[PDB]
Coordinates of C-alpha atoms in Angstrom, one line a residue:
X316 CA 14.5 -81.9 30.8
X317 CA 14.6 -77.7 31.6
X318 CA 16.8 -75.9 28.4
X319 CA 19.8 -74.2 28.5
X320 CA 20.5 -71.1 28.0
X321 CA 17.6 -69.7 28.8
X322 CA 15.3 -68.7 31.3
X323 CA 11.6 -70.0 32.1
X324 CA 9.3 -68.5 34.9
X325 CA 6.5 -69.2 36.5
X326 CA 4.2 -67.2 38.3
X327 CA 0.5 -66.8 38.9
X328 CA -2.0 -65.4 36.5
X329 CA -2.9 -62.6 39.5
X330 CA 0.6 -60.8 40.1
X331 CA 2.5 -58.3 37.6
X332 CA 3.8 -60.9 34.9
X333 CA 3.9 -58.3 32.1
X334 CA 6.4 -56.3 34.4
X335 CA 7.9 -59.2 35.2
X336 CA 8.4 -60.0 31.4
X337 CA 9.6 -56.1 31.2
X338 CA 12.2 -57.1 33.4
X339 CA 13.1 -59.9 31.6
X340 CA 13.5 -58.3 28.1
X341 CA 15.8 -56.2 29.7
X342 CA 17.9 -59.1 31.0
X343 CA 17.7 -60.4 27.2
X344 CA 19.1 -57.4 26.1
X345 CA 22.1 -57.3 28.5
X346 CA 22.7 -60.6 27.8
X347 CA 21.1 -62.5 24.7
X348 CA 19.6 -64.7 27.0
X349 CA 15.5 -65.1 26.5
X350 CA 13.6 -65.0 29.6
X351 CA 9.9 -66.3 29.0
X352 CA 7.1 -65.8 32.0
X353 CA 4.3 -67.9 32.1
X354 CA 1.4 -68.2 34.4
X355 CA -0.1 -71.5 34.1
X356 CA -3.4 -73.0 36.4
X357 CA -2.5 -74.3 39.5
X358 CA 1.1 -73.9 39.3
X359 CA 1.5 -74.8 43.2
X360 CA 0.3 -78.3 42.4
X361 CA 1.8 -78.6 39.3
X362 CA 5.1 -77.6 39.8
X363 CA 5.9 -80.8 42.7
X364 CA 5.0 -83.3 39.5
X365 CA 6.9 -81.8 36.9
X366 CA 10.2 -80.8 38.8
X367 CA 9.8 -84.5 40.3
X368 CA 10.7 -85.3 36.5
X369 CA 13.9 -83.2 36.1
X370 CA 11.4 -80.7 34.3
X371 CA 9.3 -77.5 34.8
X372 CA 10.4 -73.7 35.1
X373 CA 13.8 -72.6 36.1
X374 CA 12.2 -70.1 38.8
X375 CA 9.0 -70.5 40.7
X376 CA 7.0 -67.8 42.4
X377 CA 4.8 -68.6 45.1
X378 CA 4.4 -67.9 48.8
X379 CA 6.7 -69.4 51.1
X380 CA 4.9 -71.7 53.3
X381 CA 4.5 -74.4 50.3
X382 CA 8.2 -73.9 49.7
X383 CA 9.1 -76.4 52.6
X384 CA 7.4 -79.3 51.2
X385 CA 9.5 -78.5 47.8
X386 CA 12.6 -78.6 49.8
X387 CA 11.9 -81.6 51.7
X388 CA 11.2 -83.9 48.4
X389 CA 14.7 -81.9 47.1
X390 CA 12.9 -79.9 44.5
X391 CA 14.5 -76.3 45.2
X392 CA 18.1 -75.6 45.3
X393 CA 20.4 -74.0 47.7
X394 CA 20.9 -69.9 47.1
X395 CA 24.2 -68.2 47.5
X396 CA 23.6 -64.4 48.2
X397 CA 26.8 -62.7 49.5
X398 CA 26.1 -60.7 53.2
X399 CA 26.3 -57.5 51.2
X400 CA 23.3 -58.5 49.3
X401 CA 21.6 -59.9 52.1
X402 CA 21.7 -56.9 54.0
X403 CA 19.6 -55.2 51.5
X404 CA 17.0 -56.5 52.7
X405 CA 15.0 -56.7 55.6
X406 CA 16.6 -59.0 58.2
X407 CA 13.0 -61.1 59.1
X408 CA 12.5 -62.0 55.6
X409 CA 15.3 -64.1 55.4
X410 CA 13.8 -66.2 58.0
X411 CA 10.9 -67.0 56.0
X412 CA 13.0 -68.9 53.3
X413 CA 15.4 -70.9 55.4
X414 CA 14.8 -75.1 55.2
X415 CA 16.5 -76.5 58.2
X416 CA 19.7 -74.2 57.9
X417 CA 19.3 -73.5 54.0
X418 CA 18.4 -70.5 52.5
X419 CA 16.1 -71.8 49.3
X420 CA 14.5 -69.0 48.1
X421 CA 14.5 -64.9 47.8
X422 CA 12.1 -63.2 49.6
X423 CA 10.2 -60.9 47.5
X424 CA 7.2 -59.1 49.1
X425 CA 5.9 -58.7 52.3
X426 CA 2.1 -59.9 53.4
X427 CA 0.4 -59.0 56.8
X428 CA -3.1 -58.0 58.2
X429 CA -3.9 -54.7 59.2
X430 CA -6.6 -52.7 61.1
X431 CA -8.7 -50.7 58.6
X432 CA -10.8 -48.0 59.7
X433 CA -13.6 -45.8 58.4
X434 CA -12.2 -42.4 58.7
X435 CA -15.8 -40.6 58.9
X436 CA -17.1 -43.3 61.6
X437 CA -14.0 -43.0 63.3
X438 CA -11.9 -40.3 64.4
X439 CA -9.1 -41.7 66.1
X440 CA -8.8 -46.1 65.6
X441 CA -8.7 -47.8 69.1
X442 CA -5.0 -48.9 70.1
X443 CA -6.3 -51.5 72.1
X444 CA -8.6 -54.5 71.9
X445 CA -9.5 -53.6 76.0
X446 CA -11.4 -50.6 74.6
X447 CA -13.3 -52.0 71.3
X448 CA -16.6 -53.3 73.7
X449 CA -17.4 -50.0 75.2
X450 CA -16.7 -48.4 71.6
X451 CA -19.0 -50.7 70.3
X452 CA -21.6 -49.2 72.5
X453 CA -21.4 -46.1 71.4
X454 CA -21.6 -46.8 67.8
X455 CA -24.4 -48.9 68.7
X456 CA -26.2 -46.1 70.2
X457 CA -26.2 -44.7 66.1
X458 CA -26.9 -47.5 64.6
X459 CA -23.3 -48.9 63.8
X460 CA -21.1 -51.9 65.3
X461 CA -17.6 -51.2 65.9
X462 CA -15.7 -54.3 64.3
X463 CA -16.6 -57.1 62.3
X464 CA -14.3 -59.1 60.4
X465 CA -13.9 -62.9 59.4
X466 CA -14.2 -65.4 62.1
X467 CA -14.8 -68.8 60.6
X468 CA -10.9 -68.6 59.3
X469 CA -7.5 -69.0 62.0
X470 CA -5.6 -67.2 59.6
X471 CA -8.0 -63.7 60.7
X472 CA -8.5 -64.5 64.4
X473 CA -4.9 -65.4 65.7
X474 CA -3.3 -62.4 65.5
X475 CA -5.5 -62.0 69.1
X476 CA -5.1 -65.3 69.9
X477 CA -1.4 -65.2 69.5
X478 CA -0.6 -61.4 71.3
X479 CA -0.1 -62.5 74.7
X480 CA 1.9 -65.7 73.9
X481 CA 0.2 -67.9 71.6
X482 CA 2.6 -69.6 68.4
X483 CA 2.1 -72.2 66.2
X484 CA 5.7 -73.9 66.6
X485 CA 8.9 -73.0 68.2
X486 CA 11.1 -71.3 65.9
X487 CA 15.1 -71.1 66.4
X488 CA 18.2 -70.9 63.8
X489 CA 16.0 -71.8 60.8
X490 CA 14.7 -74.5 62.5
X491 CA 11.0 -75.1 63.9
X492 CA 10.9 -77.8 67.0
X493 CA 7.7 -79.2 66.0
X494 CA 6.7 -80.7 69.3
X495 CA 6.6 -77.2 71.0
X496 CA 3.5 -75.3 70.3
X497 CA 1.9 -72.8 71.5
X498 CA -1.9 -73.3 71.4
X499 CA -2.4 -74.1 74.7
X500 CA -1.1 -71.6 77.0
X501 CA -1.8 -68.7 78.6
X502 CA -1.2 -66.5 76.4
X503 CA -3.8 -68.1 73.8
X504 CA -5.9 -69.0 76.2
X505 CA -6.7 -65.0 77.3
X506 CA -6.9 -64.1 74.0
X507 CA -9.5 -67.1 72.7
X508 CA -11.1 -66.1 76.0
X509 CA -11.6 -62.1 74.8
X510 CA -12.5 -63.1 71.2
X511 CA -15.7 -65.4 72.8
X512 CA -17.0 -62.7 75.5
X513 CA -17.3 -60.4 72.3
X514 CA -19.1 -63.5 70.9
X515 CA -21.0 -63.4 73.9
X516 CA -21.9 -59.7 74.7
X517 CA -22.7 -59.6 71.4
X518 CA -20.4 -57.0 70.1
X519 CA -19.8 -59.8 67.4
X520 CA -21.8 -62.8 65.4
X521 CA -19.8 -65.7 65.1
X522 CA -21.6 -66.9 62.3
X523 CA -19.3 -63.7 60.4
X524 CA -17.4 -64.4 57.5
X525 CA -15.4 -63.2 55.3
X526 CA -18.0 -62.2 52.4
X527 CA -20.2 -60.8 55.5
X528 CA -17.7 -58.7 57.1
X529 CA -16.6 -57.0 53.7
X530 CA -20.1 -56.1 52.8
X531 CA -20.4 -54.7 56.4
X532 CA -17.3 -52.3 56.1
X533 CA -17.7 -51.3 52.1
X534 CA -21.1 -50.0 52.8
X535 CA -20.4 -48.1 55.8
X536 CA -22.4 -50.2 58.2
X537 CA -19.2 -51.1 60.4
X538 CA -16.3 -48.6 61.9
X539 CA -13.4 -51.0 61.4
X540 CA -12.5 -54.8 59.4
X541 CA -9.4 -57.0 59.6
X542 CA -7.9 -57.4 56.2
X543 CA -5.3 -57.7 54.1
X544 CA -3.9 -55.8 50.6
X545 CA -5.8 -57.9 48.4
X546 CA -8.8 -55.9 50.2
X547 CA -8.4 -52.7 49.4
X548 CA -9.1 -52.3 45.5
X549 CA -13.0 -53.0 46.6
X550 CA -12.9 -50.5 49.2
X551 CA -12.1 -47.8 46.5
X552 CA -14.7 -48.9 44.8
X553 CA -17.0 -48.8 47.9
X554 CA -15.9 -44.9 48.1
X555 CA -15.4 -45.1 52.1
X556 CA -13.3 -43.2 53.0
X557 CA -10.3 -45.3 55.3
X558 CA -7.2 -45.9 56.8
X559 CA -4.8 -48.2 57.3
X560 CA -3.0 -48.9 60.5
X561 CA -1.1 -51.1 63.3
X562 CA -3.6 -53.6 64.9
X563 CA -4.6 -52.9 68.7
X564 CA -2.2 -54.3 71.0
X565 CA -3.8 -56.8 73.8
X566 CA -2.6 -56.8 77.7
X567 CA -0.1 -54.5 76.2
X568 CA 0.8 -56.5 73.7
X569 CA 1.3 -56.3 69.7
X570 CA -1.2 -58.4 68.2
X571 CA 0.8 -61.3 65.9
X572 CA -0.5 -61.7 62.5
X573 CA 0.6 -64.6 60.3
X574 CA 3.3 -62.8 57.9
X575 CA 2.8 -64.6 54.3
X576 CA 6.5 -63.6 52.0
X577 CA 6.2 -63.9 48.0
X578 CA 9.0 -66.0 47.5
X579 CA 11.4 -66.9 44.3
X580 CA 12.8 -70.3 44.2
X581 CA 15.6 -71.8 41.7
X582 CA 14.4 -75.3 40.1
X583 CA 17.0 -77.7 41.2
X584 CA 16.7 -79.7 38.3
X585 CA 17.8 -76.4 36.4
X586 CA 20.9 -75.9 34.3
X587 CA 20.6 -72.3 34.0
X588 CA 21.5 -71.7 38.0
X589 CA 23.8 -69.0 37.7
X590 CA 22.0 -66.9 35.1
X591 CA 18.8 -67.1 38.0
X592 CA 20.9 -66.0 40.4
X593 CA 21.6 -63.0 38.1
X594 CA 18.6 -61.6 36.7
X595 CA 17.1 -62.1 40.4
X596 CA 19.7 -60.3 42.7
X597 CA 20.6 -57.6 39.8
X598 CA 17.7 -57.5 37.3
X599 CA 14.3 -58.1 40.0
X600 CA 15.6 -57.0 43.2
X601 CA 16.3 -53.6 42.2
X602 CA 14.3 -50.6 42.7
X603 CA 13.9 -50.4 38.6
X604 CA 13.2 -54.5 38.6
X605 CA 10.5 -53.8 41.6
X606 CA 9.0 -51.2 40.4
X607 CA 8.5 -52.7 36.7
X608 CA 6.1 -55.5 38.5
X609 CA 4.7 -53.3 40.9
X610 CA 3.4 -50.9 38.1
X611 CA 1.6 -53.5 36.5
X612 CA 0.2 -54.8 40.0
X613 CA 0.6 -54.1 43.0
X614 CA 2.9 -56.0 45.2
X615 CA 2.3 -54.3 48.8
X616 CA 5.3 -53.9 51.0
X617 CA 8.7 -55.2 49.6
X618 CA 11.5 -57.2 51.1
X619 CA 14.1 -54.9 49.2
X620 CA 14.7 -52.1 52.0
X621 CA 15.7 -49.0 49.4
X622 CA 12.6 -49.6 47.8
X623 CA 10.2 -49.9 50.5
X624 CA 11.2 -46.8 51.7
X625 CA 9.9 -45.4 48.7
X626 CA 6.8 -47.3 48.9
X627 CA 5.7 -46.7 52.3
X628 CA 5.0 -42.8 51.5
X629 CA 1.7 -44.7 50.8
X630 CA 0.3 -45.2 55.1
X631 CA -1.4 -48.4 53.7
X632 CA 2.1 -50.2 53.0
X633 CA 3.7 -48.7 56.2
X634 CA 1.1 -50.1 58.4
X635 CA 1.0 -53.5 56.3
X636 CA 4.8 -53.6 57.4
X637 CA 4.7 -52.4 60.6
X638 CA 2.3 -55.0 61.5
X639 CA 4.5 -57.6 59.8
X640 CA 7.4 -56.9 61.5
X641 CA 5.4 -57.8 65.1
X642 CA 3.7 -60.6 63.4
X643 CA 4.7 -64.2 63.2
X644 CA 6.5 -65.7 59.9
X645 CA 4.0 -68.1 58.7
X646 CA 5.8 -71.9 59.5
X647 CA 7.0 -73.2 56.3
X648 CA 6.9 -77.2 57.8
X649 CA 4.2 -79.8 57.0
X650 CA 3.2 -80.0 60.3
X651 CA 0.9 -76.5 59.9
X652 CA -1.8 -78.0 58.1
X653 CA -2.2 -79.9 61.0
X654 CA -2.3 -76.6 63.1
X655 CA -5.0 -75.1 60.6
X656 CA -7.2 -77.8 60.8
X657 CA -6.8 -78.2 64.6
X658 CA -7.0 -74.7 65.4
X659 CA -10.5 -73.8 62.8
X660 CA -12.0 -76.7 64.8
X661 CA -11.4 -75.0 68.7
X662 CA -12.0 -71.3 67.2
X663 CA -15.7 -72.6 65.7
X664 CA -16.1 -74.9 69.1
X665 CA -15.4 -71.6 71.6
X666 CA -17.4 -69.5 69.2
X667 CA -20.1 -71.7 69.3
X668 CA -19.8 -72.5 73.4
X669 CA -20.1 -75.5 72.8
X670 CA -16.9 -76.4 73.8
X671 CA -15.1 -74.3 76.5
X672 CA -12.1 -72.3 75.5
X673 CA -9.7 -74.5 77.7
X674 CA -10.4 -77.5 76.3
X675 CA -11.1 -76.5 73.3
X676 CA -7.2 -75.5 72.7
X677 CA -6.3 -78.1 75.3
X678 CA -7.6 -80.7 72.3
X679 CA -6.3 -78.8 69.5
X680 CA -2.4 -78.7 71.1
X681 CA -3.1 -82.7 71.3
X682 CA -4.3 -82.8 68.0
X683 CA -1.3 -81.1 66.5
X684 CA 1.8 -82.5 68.8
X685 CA 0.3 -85.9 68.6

């Protein structure tokens, strides 16, 4: 049984608890009320057992894909945010923390891939995939390869996959139809069938991963990577000098990357339901609660719209949410881990030829709507 009277978060041991905790003492001194931040080890797996129980923190922070399996055993509770504060913030992030019609959760911050560049490789970055193979020749004449990035992982190749109509499931009114996906139609089928003629041509290995591909890039061996904010603070250290920007669009059409939201979430076993919805809509979505976290890490874009505008003066954050805002929310139903299995499996079976790239999404689709 979860206190009264008092406030206990969880969040993990990676983000900006101390400015969290900043945040909080100035709650306490507004109100009385203590607010106390913790960052236990595998909170994710913990918190389903102990709210199971009536106990656990008051709010949980955690992306929002694992929030729908919370909601489904009834472990979140419903939020209440008036249409004035709603429309502080950006309209697409409230579709990431809707359960079948409930909101359950405030969005927080804003996650998306982005093309990253080297600057002294590359002039101008490529707007379109079309033109990466005869770029890669050129390079190639120097030495260089034009793009490498992590293939072994869905999560890094679909934003191709998914430009010209690819989607993991049907999304409408805060509802996913989870017998219509997109794996196996046109759409993903020219992109799969791009990403394996690069394969093939050999402007890429598809034995690249993610450790691979960063090595590549931070030592100046590769003119662009596919990465996210949690990148960057080794590419500082690598001294390249880069950019940020919008991925290339294919047939003329944005690429889609998977768009991952930091999410807060109210305990439903909690007695203190009122006092979270304070300190979260007037204490930590503020500009002043924001930037308290922010300055003690980094959070990347923001949901909060007055804020982000401030933020975005850096080009890295811009880009990050200028490629989330053509990207595709990341499902929040139980049915995705399905799709990530399915959909590794017919990437690695392309790569690798030894499957073709029609019936290797023709078997995925089965695999996920069976």
């Amino acid at each position: 049984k979860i206190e009264e009277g008092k406030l206990v978060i969880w969040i993990n041991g990676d983000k900006g608890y101390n400015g969290l905790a900043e945040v909080g003492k100035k709650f306490e001194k507004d109100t009385g009320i203590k607010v106390t931040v913790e960052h236990p080890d595998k909170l994710e797996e913990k918190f389903p057992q102990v709210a199971a129980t009536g106990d656990g923190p008051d709010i949980i922070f955690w992306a929002h894909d694992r929030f729908g399996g919370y909601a489904q055993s009834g472990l979140l509770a419903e939020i209440t945010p008036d249409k004035a504060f709603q429309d502080k913030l950006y309209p697409f992030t409230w579709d990431a923390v809707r359960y079948n019609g409930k909101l359950i959760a405030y969005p927080i911050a804003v996650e998306a891939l982005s093309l990253i560049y080297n600057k002294d490789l590359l002039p101008n970055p490529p707007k379109t995939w079309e033109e990466i193979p005869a770029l890669d020749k050129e390079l190639k004449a120097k030495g260089k390869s034009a793009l490498m990035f992590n293939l072994q992982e869905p999560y890094f190749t679909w934003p191709l996959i998914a430009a010209d109509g690819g989607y993991a499931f049907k999304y409408e009114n805060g509802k996913y139809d989870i017998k219509d996906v997109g794996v196996d139609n046109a759409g993903a089928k020219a992109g799969l069938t791009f990403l394996v003629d690069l394969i093939k041509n050999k402007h890429m290995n598809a034995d690249t991963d993610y450790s691979i591909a960063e090595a590549a890039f931070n030592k100046g061996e590769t003119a662009m990577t596919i990465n996210g904010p949690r990148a960057w603070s080794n590419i500082d250290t690598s001294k390249v000098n880069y950019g940020v920007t919008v991925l290339p669009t294919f047939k003329g059409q944005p690429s889609k990357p998977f768009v991952g939201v930091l999410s807060a979430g109210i305990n439903a076993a909690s007695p203190n339901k009122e006092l979270a919805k304070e300190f979260l809509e007037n204490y930590l979505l503020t500009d002043e609660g924001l930037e308290a976290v922010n300055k003690d890490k980094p959070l990347g874009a923001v949901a909060l719209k007055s804020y982000e505008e401030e933020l975005a003066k850096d080009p890295r954050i811009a880009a990050t949410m200028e490629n989330a805002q053509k990207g595709e929310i990341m499902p929040n139903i139980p049915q995705m881990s399905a799709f990530w299995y399915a959909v590794r499996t017919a990437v690695i079976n392309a790569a690798s030829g030894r499957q073709t790239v029609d019936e290797a999404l023709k078997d995925a689709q089965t695999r996920i709507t069976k």
